[PDB]
Design a protein around this ligand. Structure first.
Ligand code: SF4
Ligand code: F3S
Length: 106
């Protein structure tokens, strides 16, 4: 019930996965999502994200409410990621840029 939002796109640091007790993170080309049914809400991944893109479902910003359903539907099609990887090459350039959902890759 924790949701990855907008600032993850084009950053994808992947520090979030090393602290997940249940391995419920699924990866896309430039984005990660959380499988809402497997997540146990221990909140351990939220302070680990450099993009600060992870939020508890009831705390997801009003203008990013879309990502709640997005994480559930993409967690169903993307592959499981359980290990840390290097961030995307220009992650710091995109950290803090808004409306990055227009750059989301399936
Ligand atoms: S809140 Fe806990 S169980 Fe849910 S995705 Fe984050 S680390 Fe994994
Ligand atoms: S940028 Fe994305 S890959 Fe994890 S560390 Fe943050 S939710």
């Amino acid at each position: 019930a924790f949701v990855v939002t907008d600032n993850c796109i084009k950053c994808k640091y992947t520090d979030c996965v090393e602290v997940c007790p249940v391995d419920c993170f699924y990866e896309g080309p430039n984005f990660l999502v959380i499988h809402p049914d497997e997540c146990i809400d221990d909140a351990l991944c939220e302070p680990e994200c450099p993009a600060q893109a992870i939020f508890s479902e009831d705390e997801v910003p009003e203008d990013m409410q879309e990502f709640i359903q997005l994480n559930a539907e993409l967690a169903e099609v993307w592959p499981n990621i359980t290990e840390k990887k290097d961030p995307l090459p220009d992650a710091e350039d995109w950290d803090g840029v808004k409306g990055k959902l227009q750059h989301l890759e399936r």
